[PDB]
Amino acid sequence: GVMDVNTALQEVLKTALIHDGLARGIREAAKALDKRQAHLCVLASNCDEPMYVKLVEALCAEHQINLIKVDDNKKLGEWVGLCKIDREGKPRKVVGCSCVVVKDYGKESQAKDVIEEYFKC
Amino acid sequence: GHQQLYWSHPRKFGQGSRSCRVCSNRHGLIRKYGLNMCRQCFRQYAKDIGFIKLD
Amino acid sequence: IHRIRITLTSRNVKSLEKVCADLIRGAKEKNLKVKGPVRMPTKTLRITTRKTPCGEGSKTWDRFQMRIHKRLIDLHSPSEIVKQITSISIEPGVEVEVTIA
Amino acid sequence: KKRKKKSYTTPKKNKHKRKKVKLAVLKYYKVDENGKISRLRRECPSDECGAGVFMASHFDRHYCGKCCLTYCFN
Amino acid sequence: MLMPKKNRIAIYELLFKEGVMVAKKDVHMPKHPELADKNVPNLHVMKAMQSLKSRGYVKEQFAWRHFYWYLTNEGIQYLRDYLHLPPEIVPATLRRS
C-alpha cells in the first residue's frame, strides 16, 4: 500500500528499537558518523539548547550528511517504547538517531526507498 | 585491568577448587581411584558407586 | 588378522558368566573356531573409611571392597559376525572392550 | 559472624560519585567559527575510536586505557 | 554489572538455542563450560540467573555444586521479548526429535 515518510518514521524508529541502539546523552555520538555505518537521521521540531543543535549541524557538515527535520517526532518515538526495564526510572530524549544500518537483514520494507529518496535530497 | 589479570596465579597443587565433588566441604578428601569426595558423601553414597561390605 | 578379542568386565560373576555363555553359544551357533573364556584375576579394590563423621568414640571403620571380574573371549572371526551376535540385549553392568589386531 | 570494628579510618567501600555539567564537550571545541577541527586530540590507531572518542595528553606520559598505547612527549 | 548489555543479549541468544543447561558453582572460573572461549564469565552467568530469580520467572535445582537452570513460559516470553526477535527460534532439540 501507499506509505509515506511520516508513517515510515515509525518503521525506522521500530527498526532502531529492535537493534536497541538509540544513543543518548552527549558523549560518544560521532562514533558511527566517522565510518558511515549509519545511513539515516531524524530531527525534532524546534530546539531547547542552541549548543546541541549547532554541534549536530557542524557534525553533519563534517560528514556531509543531510538531516531531516520533522514535527512531533517525540510521539512517534515514544510509541515504540523507551521504558528501560519496567516502570523504574524515566526516559528522556531529544534527537532520534537510527544508528548503524537502515533496514533489517531479514525484514525489508518499501519505506526504505521513500525514506532515502527524501533523505538524499 | 582485572579482566586480563583474572586468575593470575595457577593454583594447581591445592584442592580448594578441587575439593569434594558433592558440596562445599573439605577435611578428609581421598583420591583413591579419583573419587574426589570426603568420607561423608562417599559413605552415604557408596551404594551407587558399587562398593559393598562383605569383608 | 581376524582374531577379535572381547575384554568383557563386570561386577557380578553370575551376570558375567551368563554373558559369556550366551556369547559363546552365539559363536557356537555359527561356524567359528573359538577359545574358552579366559578369566583374568579379579581386581579387589579396598576402601577403608572411618564411620563417625567427626572423630569420636571407638576407632571404627567400614571396609568397602569392589570385586571386578574380567573375562576375555578371543575368536577367529571378522568382527562383523561378533557384532551380529552382539545384538542380544547385553546384560547391564557388563562392559565390552573391542580389540582388533 | 562478628564485628570487625571499622572505626579508625574510612569504613567506606562505596565507589566515587561526582557532579558535573550536562553539556561536557571535551572531544571538540565550540565558539570557533570553523566547520573543521584543528586536530589537537591525538590520533588513536585502535579500531575502537571514532570521531566521538579521543584522548587528552598531560605533561606526564601519555594516558591510555583502551588499547595501551604511548604518544609520549615529556 | 560493569558488563555490556550486548553480551547479556548474546547469553540470552545462546540459552534460547536450547531450553536449559547447567552452571558450575564458582566465581573464579574465567570461562563457561558450554560457552567456552566466548568471553562469558561464570560469575556473570550466575549473576544473570540470580537476576531472573529476583524477577521470579526462573528457578533452579542445584545439585552436587552445580546450578540446574529452569524456564517457565512467561520467562521464555520475556527472553524472546528482550532479544527483540521473533519466537521462531524454538529449541533445536525438537528439530532433532
Query: Does residue B44 have a known ligand-binding role?
Result: no
- The neighbouring-strand residues paired with C98 are C6
- The torsion defined by the Cα of B12, B13, B15 and B17, in degrees rounded to 10, comes to -10
> What sections of chain B are H helices per DSSP?
2-5, 39-44, 46-49
Q: Is D45 on the interface with A (CB under 8 A)?
A: no
C37-to-A110, C40, C42, C91 alpha-carbon distances in Å: 78, 9, 14, 17
Which domains occur in chain C, in start order? 1-101 (3.30.70.600)
Q: Would you call E64 and B23 a contact, using CB atoms and an 8 Å cutoff?
A: yes
- Of the candidates D23, D27, D52, which has its C-beta nearest A51's C-beta? D23
Cα–Cα dist D47/D50, whole Å: 8
Query: What backbone phi and psi angles, to 5 degrees, belong to C77?
Result: -165, 150
Binding-face residues of A in 16-75 toward D, CB within 8 A: 26-35, 49, 51-52, 54-55, 58-59, 61-62
Cα–Cα dist C17/C71, whole Å: 9
How many other C-beta atoms lie within 10 A of the C-beta of residue C85?
Answer: 20
- Domains of chain B: total: 1
Q: Are A42 and A98 in contact (CB under 8 A)?
A: yes
E25-to-B3, B13, E33, E45 alpha-carbon distances in Å: 20, 20, 11, 10
This structure's resolution (angstroms)?
2.7
- Chain A positions touching E84 (Cβ under 8 A) are 17-20
Which domains occur in chain E, in start order? 3-97 (1.10.10.10)
Taking CA D72 as the corner, what is the angle to CA D67 and CA D73, rounded to the nearest 5 degrees?
Answer: 150
- Chain A positions touching D22 (Cβ under 8 A) are 26
Whose grid coordinates read 576375555? Answer: C72
Q: Are D62 and D69 in contact (CB under 8 A)?
A: yes
Joined grid coordinates for residue C11:
561386577
Q: How far is E45 from chain A (nearest CA, A)?
A: 19
Spacing of C-alpha A97 from chain mean position: 3
Query: What backbone phi and psi angles, to 5 degrees, belong to B20?
Result: -55, 130
Joined grid coordinates for residue D38:
584543528
Residues 6+ apart with CB under 8 A from C87: none
Spacing of C-alpha E84 from chain mean position: 16
- Chain C positions touching B30 (Cβ under 8 A) are 47, 49
Q: Would you call A55 and D25 a contact, using CB atoms and an 8 Å cutoff?
A: yes
B13-to-B21, B22, B38, E26 alpha-carbon distances in Å: 17, 20, 18, 18
How many other C-beta atoms lie within 10 A of the C-beta of residue A102?
Answer: 18
- Of the candidates B7, B17, B22, which has its C-beta nearest E64's C-beta? B22
B2: containing domain: 1-55
Query: Does residue B23 have a known ligand-binding role?
Result: yes
Instruction: Please provide the size of chain E in residues.
Output: 97
Cα–Cα dist E4/E70, whole Å: 24
DSSP E37: T
Query: Does residue B16 have a known ligand-binding role?
Result: no
Q: Is D11 on the interface with A (CB under 8 A)?
A: no
B33-to-B19, C43, C51, C54 alpha-carbon distances in Å: 15, 13, 20, 24
Q: Is B7 on the interface with E (CB under 8 A)?
A: yes
Cα–Cα dist E41/E47, whole Å: 10
C vs B contact (3+ beta-carbon pairs below 8 A): yes
- Chain B positions touching C47 (Cβ under 8 A) are 30, 32, 42, 51
Residues 6+ apart with CB under 8 A from B51: C45, C47, C64, C65, C66
Cα–Cα dist D52/D40, whole Å: 14
3-state SS class at A3? coil
**Residue at B17: amino acid letter:** S
Q: Which of D40, E25, E82, D5 is nearest to B20 (CA)?
A: E25
- Domains of chain A: total: 1
- Pairing outcome for strands E66-68 and C61-76: unpaired
**DSSP state string for A23-84:** --SSSS-SHHHHHT------B-SS-S-HHHHHHHHHHHHHHT----B-SSHHHHHHTT---S
Taking CA B10 as the corner, what is the angle to CA B4 and CA B11, rounded to the nearest 5 degrees?
Answer: 135
**Residue at B15: amino acid letter:** Q
Chain C neighbors (3+ CB pairs < 8 Å): B
A vs D contact (3+ beta-carbon pairs below 8 A): yes
Residues of E with CB under 8 A from a CB of A: 5-6, 9, 84-85
Joined grid coordinates for residue E23:
552452571
A105: containing domain: 5-121
Instruction: Please provide the size of chain A in residues.
Output: 121
Joined grid coordinates for residue A118:
527524501
CATH number at residue B16: 4.10.830.10
- Chain E positions touching B6 (Cβ under 8 A) are 30
- Chain B positions touching E42 (Cβ under 8 A) are none
3-state SS class at B42? helix
DSSP B30: B
Largest Cα–Cα separation, chain A:
41
DSSP C18: H
